[PDB]
Design a protein around this ligand. Structure first.
Ligand SMILES: O=P(O)(O)O[C@H]1[C@H](O)[C@@H](OP(=O)(O)O)[C@H](O)[C@@H](OP(=O)(O)O)[C@H]1O
Length: 87
């Protein structure tokens, strides 16, 4: 939607620095996860136990369809969030 997007933005800008996903990339991945049935809300990313199925599903789609466009964004989020939850 909006609020959660900016939250993710400022978050990754602190963990990944300048090498963070652009807002235009964040929204794209967000909408994909919803239509894929992987997620249902923008706050779903706050669930660590739901990361595994997503990474698996995206990896499958990437290696089968031949495109890691959505996987790249996920990897960036996963890395930053994993580090955040590590503290
Ligand atoms: O303020 P930053 O540390 O430079 O991060 C920005 C902000 O999060 C911005 O939201 P806002 O315009 O509300 O500050 C967003 O739109 C940008 O993504 P993009 O470059 O594709 O336009 C992003 O880099």
């Amino acid at each position: 939607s909006e609020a959660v997007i900016k939250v993710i933005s400022s978050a990754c800008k602190t963990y990944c620095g300048k090498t963070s996903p652009s807002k235009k990339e964040i929204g794209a991945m967000l909408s994909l996860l919803q239509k894929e049935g992987l997620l249902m809300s923008p706050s779903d990313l706050y669930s660590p136990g739901s990361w595994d199925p997503i990474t698996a599903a995206l990896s499958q789609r990437a290696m089968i369809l031949g495109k890691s466009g959505e996987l790249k964004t996920w990897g960036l989020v996963l890395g930053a969030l994993k580090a955040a939850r590590e503290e």
